[PDB]
Amino acid sequence: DTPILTFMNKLDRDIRDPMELLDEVENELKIGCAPITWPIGCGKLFKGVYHLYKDETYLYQSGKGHTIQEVRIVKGLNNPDLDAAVGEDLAQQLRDELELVKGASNEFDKELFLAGEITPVFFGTALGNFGV
């Protein structure tokens, strides 16, 4: 009955739909998904992750994987600086996906996590040292 944290590695790479990634984790691993962060773009378009519970956006910088990059936050989820820093196009897809996410996922519950029934899912990149 050991608890599981989930880390979605390799956001530097062109990946699958993180929605679909949640299905594969719930369906095939028989365990609930509770997103904590959410990727904004992937591959050449990875811009960072929006934290769902802190409501802010940590901005990914390319190739600082050897040390820890400068923590660069954009506060609001509708902050027009998220549009400026990420492009308003990608910024809306963040907003859209987040809508769908809330209707098909889970709030992180500490009790169910310790019971091994939901996993806190973090999206990141261990190579870029971002999300760790």
Next chain:
RNA sequence: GGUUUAGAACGUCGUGAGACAGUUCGGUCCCUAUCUGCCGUGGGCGCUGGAGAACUGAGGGGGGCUGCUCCUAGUACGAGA
């Protein structure tokens, strides 16, 4: 330096002088450029009164190589490497 002169020897051929597209050691490389051409550099005259400058630019030449590293990114691609 090689190799078609003259010296000398070996093998080889020839009775021999010699000979071998066999080898071996030695062994004189001239020219003050008239013309053409070319690199530079002046003189003359022209250009329509003479002169001092600053120009335009028809055209002509020069130039034109490329390694490695880093960012993108160990991303696309790839099961990996």
